[PDB]
Amino acid sequence: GKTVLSCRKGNGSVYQVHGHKRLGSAKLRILDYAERHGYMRGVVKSIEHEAGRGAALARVEFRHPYKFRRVKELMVAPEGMFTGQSVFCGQKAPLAIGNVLPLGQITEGCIVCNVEAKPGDRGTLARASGDYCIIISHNHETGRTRLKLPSGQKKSVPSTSRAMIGIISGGGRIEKPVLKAGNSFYRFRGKRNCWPKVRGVARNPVEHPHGGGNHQHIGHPSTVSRHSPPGQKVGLIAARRTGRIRGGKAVK
């Protein structure tokens, strides 16, 4: 029959990021010679809001290390980062909220956000509003640093990786009930075409494996194998557990 809707999102026709009103990507400053052997000092020129992001971004204005010009970097602001602040980024940079240190220089148990999982990555992780890592221990022989992240899993990043001290801006967002279909409207408007979402048992059998009839019901177990082909994987994909978690929630 017809192709499932989870497969049609894979074309990217209507379902792409909207992202027009967005300001561009948010990254840490480039890793330079100064970044590695010293620190570069900028100043926070503003704090604003991407459409479709829950955090709060920052235009931080460094001076160009080489030519005569002034470069503006856009990074995800920590919690108490205020306009006019001076942000230090580099190896010599002191340990303070918003400064960016190489993650091997930071104490033992510090709170860290916006980590880069690869030394030059300009940060990929702990970037979502309110989220932070916890760096655990530095391994001085192998040159690694172990840290938990937000999902509870504990990873090991090469300690030349950089990091930004302090939790991410937004906080909450989630703790507040939406209350109406209406507030969910511009919710995703800045994000994607995710919504509203018809559940599978309602739609006809061509379109979905759940597409049954007399009584809305799946008719066959909803847990699906890992090796199931696209258009078949639907519902709970290789579930180890199912139903209420009564005690436990081991990190997934």
Partner 1 sequence: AKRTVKMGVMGRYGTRYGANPRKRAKKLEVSQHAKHFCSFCGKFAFRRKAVGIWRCDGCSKTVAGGAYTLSTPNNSTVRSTVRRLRELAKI
Sites of contact with partner 1 (CB under 8 A): 46-49, 54-56, 58, 77-84, 94-97, 107, 109-111, 129-130, 132, 165-173, 175-177, 179-180
Task: Using the minimum distance from each CB to partner 1, give the nearer residue, 5 or 97.
Answer: 97
Backbone phi and psi for residue 116, each to the nearest 5 degrees, phi listed first: -110, 125
Task: Using the minimum distance from each CB to RNA, give the nearer residue, 152 or 205.
Answer: 205
With binding defined as CB under 7 A, does residue 166 bind RNA? no
- The piece of 33-41, 106-114, 133-141, 147-155 that touches RNA (CB under 7 A) is 33-41
By the 10 Å C-beta count (0-12 exposed, 13-18 middle, 19+ buried), 218 is classed as middle
Residue 153: C-alpha distances to residues 12, 115, 117, 143, 250 (Å)? 31, 15, 14, 20, 10
Report the C-alpha gap between 228 and 237 in whole angstroms. Answer: 9
Instruction: Pick what 167 binds: RNA, partner 1, none; C-beta below 5 to 8 Å, kind-dependent.
Output: partner 1
**Among positions 13, 108, 141, 245, the unique one binding RNA when judged by CB under 7 A:** 13
Q: Measured from the CB of residue 80, what is the shortest distance to partner 1 in angstroms? A: 6
Report the C-alpha gap between 92 and 143 in whole angstroms. Answer: 19
> Strand pairing partners for 40?
89
Report the C-alpha gap between 170 and 247 in whole angstroms. Answer: 30
Ramachandran sector of residue 249 (left: φ over 0; alpha: ψ -120 to 50; beta: rest):
left
Instruction: Pick what 193 binds: partner 1, RNA, none; C-beta below 5 to 8 Å, kind-dependent.
Output: RNA
With binding defined as CB under 7 A, does residue 185 bind RNA? yes
Residue 29 has a CB neighbour count (10 Å cut-off) of 21
Task: Using the minimum distance from each CB to partner 1, give the nearer residue, 36 or 49.
Answer: 49
Instruction: Pick what 86 binds: RNA, partner 1, none; C-beta below 5 to 8 Å, kind-dependent.
Output: RNA
With binding defined as CB under 7 A, does residue 151 bind RNA? no
Instruction: Pick what 206 binds: partner 1, RNA, none; C-beta below 5 to 8 Å, kind-dependent.
Output: RNA
DSSP state, 8?
H
- CB of 104 closer than 8 Å to CB of 141: no
Q: Measured from the CB of residue 23, what is the shortest distance to partner 1 in angstroms? A: 12
Instruction: Pick what 150 binds: partner 1, RNA, none; C-beta below 5 to 8 Å, kind-dependent.
Output: none
DSSP state, 125?
B
Report the C-alpha gap between 105 and 159 in whole angstroms. Answer: 8
Task: Using the minimum distance from each CB to partner 1, give the nearer residue, 128 or 201.
Answer: 128
Instruction: Pick what 133 binds: partner 1, RNA, none; C-beta below 5 to 8 Å, kind-dependent.
Output: none
Q: What residues numbered 75-114 form the site for RNA, per CB under 7 A?
A: 82-86, 88, 90, 92-97
